[PDB]
């Protein structure tokens, strides 16, 4: 289900930028990040 590391970025939150400045190195987990 969840290992608790599913922190959808404020960047990728609807109404935000949609781009994390950190990219892949972003600590916040993207909804794009699949297994
Ligand atoms: Zn991110």
Curated annotation (Swiss-Prot):
| PTM comment | Phosphorylation by mbk-1 appears to be required for subsequent phosphorylation by plk-1.
Q: In which tissues is it expressed?
A: Asymmetrically localized to the anterior of the zygote before mitotic division, then differentially distributed to the somatic blastomere precursor cells.
Query: Looking at the record's lineage, which domain of life comes first?
Result: Eukaryota
Which effects follow disruption of this gene? RNAi-mediated knockdown reduces the expression of pie-1 in P2 blastomeres. Abolishes neg-1 expression in anterior blastomeres. RNAi-mediated knockdown in mex-6 pk440 mutant background causes a loss in plk-1 asymmetric distribution during the first embryonic cell divisions.
Zinc fingers (C3H1-type) span which residues? 3-33
Location within or outside the cell = Cytoplasm
Check the UniProt entry and state the signal peptide residues, or none.
none
Q: What does this protein do?
A: Functions with mex-6 to affect embryonic viability, establish soma germline asymmetry in embryos and establish plk-1, pie-1, mex-1, and pos-1 asymmetry in embryos. Also affects formation of intestinal cells. Binds to mRNA in vitro, and inhibits pgl-3-mediated P-granule formation, probably by competing with pgl-3 for binding to mRNA. Required for neg-1 expression in anterior blastomeres during embryogenesis.
> Which protein, by its recorded name, is this?
Zinc finger protein mex-5
- Upper classification of the organism: Eukaryota, Metazoa, Ecdysozoa, Nematoda, Chromadorea
């Amino acid at each position: 289900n969840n290992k608790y590391k599913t922190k959808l970025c404020k960047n990728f939150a609807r109404g935000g930028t949609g781009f994390c400045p950190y990219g892949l190195r972003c600590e916040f987990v993207h909804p794009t990040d699949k297994e």
